[PDB]
Amino acid sequence: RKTNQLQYMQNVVVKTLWKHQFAWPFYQPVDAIKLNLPDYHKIIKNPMDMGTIKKRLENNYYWSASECMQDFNTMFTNCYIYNKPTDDIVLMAQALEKIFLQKVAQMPQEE
Ligand code: NA
């Protein structure tokens, strides 16, 4: 069984964010080819997405919740690194990130 905090990341944080109307671009790794970057992987050194995070939770990958939180931070920050302030995807990420912060502020204690 995962830590209680990792269960929270799965059953509250991911579950809530996944259902948000703006979450879908984050469901899978950014495919530079389907969208030839051609430069994406030249700037984005550590790609991350919520599909990967969800799989890691399901597959028991994380040792502690901090690692999962870091993956979310990487996902959001990467979006901002690559995109302009006025881009639709940035507004989408911002909405999701505000929810992420509100939910991780309520993360439970391990007992
Ligand atoms: Na934990």
Numbering used by the authors: 34 to 144
Sentences from the paper on this structure:
Bromodomains (BRDs) are protein interaction modules that specifically recognize ε-N-lysine acetylation motifs, a key event in the reading process of epigenetic marks. The 61 BRDs in the human genome cluster into eight families based on structure/sequence similarity. Despite large sequence variations, all BRD modules share a conserved fold that comprises a left-handed bundle of four α helices (αZ, αA, αB, αC), linked by loop regions of variable length (ZA and BC loops), which line the Kac binding site and determine binding specificity. The four helices form a deep cavity that is extended by the two loop regions (ZA and BC loops), creating a largely hydrophobic Kac binding pocket.
The insertions at x3 are present in the N-terminal domain of BET family members. Our SPOT array and ITC data showed that multiple Kac sites are generally required for specific recognition of the histone H4 tail by all human BET family members. For the first BRDs of the BET family, a spacer of two glycine residues was optimal. Binding of di-Kac marks separated by three residue spacers as found in sequences linking the H4 K8/K16 and K16/K20 required a glycine or a hydrophobic residue in the first linker position for optimal binding to the first BET BRDs. For instance, recurrent t(15;19) chromosomal translocations that result in a fusion protein that comprises both BRD4 or BRD3 and the NUT (nuclear protein in testis) lead to an aggressive form of human squamous carcinoma (French, 2010a; French et al., 2001). The recent development of potent and highly specific Kac competitive inhibitors for BET BRDs provides a compelling case for targeting these BRDs for the treatment of an extremely aggressive subtype of squamous cell carcinoma that is caused by chromosomal rearrangement of BRD3 or BRD4 with NUT (Filippakopoulos et al., 2010; French, 2010b).
